[PDB]
RNA sequence: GUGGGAGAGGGUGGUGGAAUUCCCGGAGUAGCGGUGAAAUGCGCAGAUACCGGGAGGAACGCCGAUGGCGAAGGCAGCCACCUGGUCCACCCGUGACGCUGAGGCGCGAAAGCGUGGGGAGCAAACCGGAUUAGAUACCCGGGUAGUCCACGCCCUAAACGAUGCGCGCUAGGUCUCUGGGUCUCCUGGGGGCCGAAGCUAACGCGUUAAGCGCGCCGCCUGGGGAGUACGGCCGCAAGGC
Ligand SMILES: [Mg+2]
Ligand SMILES: [Mg+2]
Ligand SMILES: [Mg+2]
């Protein structure tokens with residue numbers, strides 16, 4: 001088991017009950033691959049440096065999990081089956097690195 | 102079809118010629134000119150002077166459709182570059198800022214042998 | 221794949237046999253079998269309408285399921301992967317939880333013991349049939365219907381597949397195994413995956429007789445006939461074509477495009 | 493040429509953290525390129541970590557790949 | 565990758581006495597451990613030639629060890645072999 | 653062993669943006685391209701320039717370095733999985749378990765080869781336009797293998813630091829990468845410049861030796877003939893030893 005941070009970007013135009021729609025499937029999957037959530041930050045709408053998918057904005061989620069390392073790749077494969085999931089970025093959790101310190 | 106006050110002005114500036122297309126705000130060309138439309142053929146099209154006439158003539162056709170202002174986007178290194186910008190500023194056409202939109206591959210297609218050179 | 225042979229005869233040096241290790245069915249087939257009337261290339265008049273056919277092994281026809289939209293929602297275990305003599309591909313046996321058995325044409329990667337299902341539901345997974353409209357753009361798929369409810373038509377040959385390139389209204393754009401680009405209706409079923417047994421195309425027949433087993437009788441060049449018989453028939457030795465190359469019925473056989481111009485299907489085609 | 497050192501300007505910060513634009517936004521040029529070590533004032537080891545982070549950041553859409561050049 | 569306990573396991577098991585950290589017998593086993601792992605990694609990734617280079621060094625280190633041991637105590641050599649499943 | 657590091661080190665799977673090309677839609681007109689200057693070419697069948705959509709392949713801008721890793725060939729977007737080497741600190745374990753290495757085995761840029769695939773940009777061959785006495789070239793317009801992937805071959809190279817590997821010994825100065833410390837300083841493993849002694853035909857090298865020594869391997873013995881012939885071994889061939 002290992003600590004990853006799962007960044008996921010969603011269609012902005014989704015209404016809130018649809019956002020929760022896409023967000024459940026996310027969560028069964030997480031629970032299905034064995035991802036045990038720890039933190040979470042749902043930062044919602046955000047403004048993009050470039051369009052993802054013809055869209056100046058995208059709806060952000062970030063999870064932090066402990067899941068068996070070998071199932072992470074399929075996790076993200078499955079997470080990404082979209083259509084409304086426009087990004088998945090799954091990173092290994094790291095001990096922060098500080099400047100001016 | 103339509104006549105517009107505000108607009109946009111494009112400079113394609115290459116070594117062999119300089120060409121200026123002026124658009125509507127939405128980007129569709131109103132009218133255009135180049136080193137050749139001025140009446141040059143050949144290498145003299147690449148020159149800085151002909152680029153001047155080019156841009157003046159571009160604007161003169163646009164101002165006849167009632168162009169007033171433009172946003173002037175330039176692309177590419179060439180001796181036609183600045184004299185084209187210069188020519189637009191004091192021509193007619195209050196020019197609102199300026200940009201360099203010149204295309205720069207993030208290391209794309211292998212270039213022609215002519216531009217490969219040092220590796 | 222692809223069994224080779226030491227040259228202990230000529231033609232054993234070049235012969236190449238399919239790999240059967242994917243196959244779990246030994247000989248017998250499930251009595252979804254039915255008998256095949258071999259034509260000899262002859263039509264209902266006794267007349268050969270397709271030349272150089274006939275001979276070749278007796279075959280039982282395995283009846284196979286080209287509409288998956290009966291069993292919508294009912295899943296099935298993949299029971300066996302079997303050999304079917306009527307197609308390049310392999311059939312997979314399905315035991316439905318219904319208790320019903322069907323043959324599916326067996327996709328690449330599909331394992332014995334998998335669960336399969338078909339319907340607007342269903343995961344996007346190898347074996348699963350869905351209306352095309354619900355298959356995510358980009359997934360490669362086989363066994364497509366051309367019009368809805370009419371049965372799978374496209375990408376059924378071993379190793380073939382198709383790709384979903386886009387949506388437009390009630391249609392999706394597919395790239396067919398031909399490379400043609402075709403609008404198909406969204407409602408049409410398709411089943412995700414490539415067909416597989418894709419090593420099929422590398423078999424080397426190897427000797428004359430092996431073509432004879434597949435019911436292909438010897439094929440004779442127009443060049444070798446007389447002119448009664450063929451546009452190339454004639455003239456002393458050998459001899460070149462002497463004219464633009466022709467079929468026996470006399471139409472041109474290099475380049476002449478034969479698809480009917482005004483076909484209604486042309487509104488829905490975009491390519492080669 | 494004088495300007496600033498651009499590391500100087502802000503306090504302790506995590507150069508590992510790829511989600512905060514307003515820190516990282518300051519390390520990009522007027523056209524959006526990762527700023528050379530000289531005017532970031534970072535270390536050797538530190539500039540790599542910064543960079544790699546910035547790369548990630550752009551993939552997530554938070555940081556640009558390129559802006560244009562204005563008012564020449 | 566072989567985890568701390570996973571090797572500790574192997575350390576404890578092959579240790580010639582309480583707290584043996586790397587005597588000859590522990591080393592061979594410890595090697596044999598990561599050898600066998602790599603050897604399976606290559607089975608899959610056959611194109612990874614750089615890692616195969618290491619395997620060679622591993623295999624070789626373990627061999628020199630085992631030869632020393634077979635010269636000094638030929639008995640606890642033959643017994644280390646069959647425990648680990650090696651020369652036959 | 654234990655605890656810690658840095659890294660374009662290798663394999664597999666994913667994934668992002670810029671650009672090029674082609675297509676579709678739009679707007680829009682008389683040229684564009686290209687060069688020393690042109691011409692071929694492209695363009696009123698609507699080109700170039702401009703914007704919107706789409707398809708597809710390749711390579712990863714800034715960071716980036718006089719940088720890092722690898723035995724070498726080599727290795728550069730980002731993500732994960734598997735995985736090699738390596739260094740530091742602690743001073744815990746084994747007790748010389750070492751060096752080197754004919755054969756053997758494995759790896760080995762590019763090009764090349766086989767079977768599939770893939771093909772945007774590039775581009776041997778080839779065509780055309782210029783140039784020239786000629787131009788089977790140099791410049792320009794086209795352009796097929798190839799470049800890309802998988803599997804399997806080929807085994808070469810200015811494969812270079814033209815500098816075999818291990819060890820001990822012989823001033824310093826300065827820059828830099830990366831560990832550890834009583835973090836100005838000291839200490840360890842790399843990467844560069846200048847240099848003591850010494851070496852060297854000189855040029856130069858010089859704690860990263862080409863110095864002073866020991867071990868063991870490879871190689872040299874005038875130039876051409878020739879890395880050719882013959883033979884042998886290997887390769888599908890080219891061809892290699
Ligand atoms: Mg010109
Ligand atoms: Mg009859
Ligand atoms: Mg018979």
Ligand SMILES: [Mg+2]
Nearest residue numbers: 438439440441
């Ligand atoms: Mg024949």
Ligand SMILES: [Mg+2]
Nearest residue numbers: 444445446454
């Ligand atoms: Mg005859």
Ligand SMILES: [Mg+2]
Nearest residue numbers: 447448449450
């Ligand atoms: Mg007759």
Ligand SMILES: [Mg+2]
Nearest residue numbers: 447448450451
């Ligand atoms: Mg006739």
Ligand SMILES: [Mg+2]
Nearest residue numbers: 452454461462
């Ligand atoms: Mg004839």
Ligand SMILES: [Mg+2]
Nearest residue numbers: 454455456457
């Ligand atoms: Mg006769």
Ligand SMILES: [Mg+2]
Nearest residue numbers: 456457458459
């Ligand atoms: Mg004759």
Ligand SMILES: [Mg+2]
Nearest residue numbers: 454456457458
């Ligand atoms: Mg004849």
Ligand SMILES: [Mg+2]
Nearest residue numbers: 398400491492
């Ligand atoms: Mg066709």
Ligand SMILES: [Mg+2]
Nearest residue numbers: 659660661721
């Ligand atoms: Mg690494």
Ligand SMILES: [Mg+2]
Nearest residue numbers: 659661735736
């Ligand atoms: Mg690593």
Ligand SMILES: [Mg+2]
Nearest residue numbers: 676677678698
């Ligand atoms: Mg058009």
Ligand SMILES: [Mg+2]
Nearest residue numbers: 661735736737
């Ligand atoms: Mg490692």
Ligand SMILES: [Mg+2]
Nearest residue numbers: 585743744745
């Ligand atoms: Mg001790």
Ligand SMILES: [Mg+2]
Nearest residue numbers: 587745746747
């Ligand atoms: Mg002792």
Ligand SMILES: [Mg+2]
Nearest residue numbers: 760761806807
């Ligand atoms: Mg090679």
